[PDB]
Symmetry: D2
Subunit: 270 residues, 4 copies
Amino acid sequence: MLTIGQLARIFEISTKTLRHYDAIGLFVPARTGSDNGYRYYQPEQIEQLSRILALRRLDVPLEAIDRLKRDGALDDPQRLRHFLQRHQHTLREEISARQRLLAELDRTLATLAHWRIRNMHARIVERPAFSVVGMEYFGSAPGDTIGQLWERFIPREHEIAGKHDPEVSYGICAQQPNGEFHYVAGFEVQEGWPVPEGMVRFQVPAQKYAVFTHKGTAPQIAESFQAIYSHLLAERGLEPKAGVDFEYYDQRFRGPLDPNSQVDLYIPIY
Amino acid sequence: MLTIGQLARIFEISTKTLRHYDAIGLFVPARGYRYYQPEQIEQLSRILALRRLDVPLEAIDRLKRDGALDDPQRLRHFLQRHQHTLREEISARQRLLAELDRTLATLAHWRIRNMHARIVERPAFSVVGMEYDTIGQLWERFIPREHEIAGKHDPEVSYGICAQQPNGEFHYVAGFEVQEGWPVPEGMVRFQVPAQKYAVFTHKGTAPQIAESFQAIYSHLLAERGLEPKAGVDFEYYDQRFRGPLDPNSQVDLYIPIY
Amino acid sequence: MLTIGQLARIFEISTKTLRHYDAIGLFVPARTGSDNGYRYYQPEQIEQLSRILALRRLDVPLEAIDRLKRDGALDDPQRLRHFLQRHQHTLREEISARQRLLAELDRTLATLAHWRIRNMHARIVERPAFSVVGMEYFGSAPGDTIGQLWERFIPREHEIAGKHDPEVSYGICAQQPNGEFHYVAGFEVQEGWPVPEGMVRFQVPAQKYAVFTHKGTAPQIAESFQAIYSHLLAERGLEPKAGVDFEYYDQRFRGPLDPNSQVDLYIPIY
Amino acid sequence: MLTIGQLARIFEISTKTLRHYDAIGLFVPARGYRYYQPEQIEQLSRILALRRLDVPLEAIDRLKRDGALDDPQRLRHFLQRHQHTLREEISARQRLLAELDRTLATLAHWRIRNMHARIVERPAFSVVGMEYDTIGQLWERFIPREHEIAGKHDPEVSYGICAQQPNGEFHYVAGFEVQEGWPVPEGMVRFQVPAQKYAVFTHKGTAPQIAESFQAIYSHLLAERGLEPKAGVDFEYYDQRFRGPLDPNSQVDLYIPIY
């Protein structure tokens, strides 16, 4: 024979959560304090109660519990199991609707993408050869990428002297003679200044450009490269010249992972 | 130029779902006839896959020319602020489902524990039915043939008879206890069940589960009551409390021979 | 004390599946028939075995089982639970990879769609008014659609007399004066023949058409209607005229749900 | 005009993954020097999302100009012949997971059943520690302060003390059994545990589970051994067998006062 205190100890509840139940008539003790309040619980009530405080863990309304125990389904192992299979069935169908509504979210996650990437503004721009000074990337260097280079660069943003435009930053995509991906983040510089250490100097040659205004993120760049080289050029009517392409970050760029930013894409054309 | 029905013929839209939006301001013909325009329809296709996830008619109404009615950039992270919401709305269910899958744990024992053994003596008797890879079909085929057996003693009571052949081999017979001397239909057979004293356990539930009660009976249930299992002719016993091999709310008396 | 027969009875196995185990040394009886083969099992072996024939239900190799019981993890409730949580963890991560590879299947399920629907051939066609005879649909009739009308029509395909072309079938999309969706499946007929019962007669007026060659299914039609009215017209450079549009089924149509079929889409233009 | 590296710079492709395809025939420059072309790249983008689901290099090789290398119609039903395959490859796991979730059922009882009570008498003793919404943090804060307590009798043994206040209220103290007379650090307190005869149950597992053993002990475990529960000072007992409040492979002696 047990008390409200040790019962709350083995169920980890407030002793008034039981008084909460005691007054409801939901979990009444097997004995009354008919005078000075000696309230005593029987050790069989433990599982009669343990089922309640595991049905509550299913968000079953505490009032929905009591109506089961008035019809008797709460002290019946057969009737309780039936209800619990129904509530089980409703849960997985709540999952089913939502599992089928995210297959429907990733199917519009490629329909949002293909509206901009088609409805994309472009203009033709020609430029003479210029000089970009900064640090470089290697498509084979273990443990590095575009987010990593622009991470360790921007602290050294001030070092470049002779900047041609402080608000304009370049991300160049050329190669080594082995076709390796030679990336350089840097600034257009006036031609007569010291190259810092350990920074490099890349000469972008004179090229004719198709300038596409990206709207999105830096990981959204590689796939917008695809549409341009794969299909958007022949659409627009122009031809890919082999040379040096680069992204063009501007005042209108407000973060690598901010989708409301923009990036200009300079691809060589004829 | 598109007319009010022509805005409806494109897809599965009612003629009033538009004037539904007119008084609101969610979408209005540009200019008592009313007019319609070319990419005024992208304004309505995005809404669809948004209403195909039940965005409120008022949620959109701000979401319109606040931005982004038109910016396809804010609605890409927005949509993953809703792939976020939904996939956690799912994950919530999983632990609920998982913890139910484990609340379904204690179910077996509150039943098995509350499974008492009644001791029953049955004089020898004879049952005719079908004899034997799966005992499931053995019932599937026999239940329609069930009115070919004459002289039934109680037609509601079928017997799932498991004989203990000495090899041992599985002998199983499903039939009805019948007065002797009646004829046996071809493809049926008359099994004679010897007189035995049984331990009778009422199993509550489902035909593939009853193996559970069997292991419970033979591991510890018989021991707890002092009874000694006896190799012989056990049988499953069915009556009005049997409502299918898959209904968790039906009862099957298991008849276990003892000494 | 039990035997191989009743043990197989309570586990629903072949009696040689136990002999299979008996020879392996995996489930040896607690006693030998040291002479005439009296093989006897103890009732405690039931759960010692019940764990095996529930681990087999997890496709755990029967040889992987035995090596657990040589190291002792099979008769230990603590060590078995640890292994079972690891195998649990691997299962959900098998789910995780595949649950994440179908969000990746429904994301390309809109990228496959937007290649054709952009790379879509079209030509301009002008036609005088003709007559189509068949049965009609109603966008408000309870329990009906395009699959249902073409279902109950094709059996009555022979009844139409005066056919202009037996291989060509039309699916018309006009209204009632209330903007309701008035669909008619039918055939182009020579103008002087009896209208069957209960079939109707729709006069398609003289119109200028943008003819788009659908590739897909009948449910793939409504969304190809979208791209045309929504964006593909201004792309192509022409204007939507209000009137009567229809699908055009041909020799090159090989089934409503056969994706390798084609359908010509006639939309009124200027 | 695109060069061999230029076919690689577009995406995350090695300079040899192409010549990988050259000898095969899966993709070859039209005419070490070799040449490249404009929608020869769609021929390679579809492959990606096909290799992003690991289609065999030889499966594709037929799938190419057999059809459909180019027909975007066969590869839409094909892809759902693989949404089919994968979503059943998942569903298979679920029943395995679900039936494991229910194989995890019988786990509790094979443990609880095999939980014996040792009867232990402890002369009165004193423990100093921290006193008390959640007893989880009560340990989280105290474990670093654990070397401020001087005069420890055994430093590996911590005590989770639950006093039975008459109201009743939750009194809980987490500390170390210490020789009396040493000083008590501020924000700690010295609890005196009376002399009691205990029933000691070794619990195998995890701090949020131990409520399980508590209900098992107080519902039927104490009865089965004739012992009478006694309101008093119970305490959880930790030692080298305790490896965290979430590790299912650690042991916690529960100390239950009896008559």
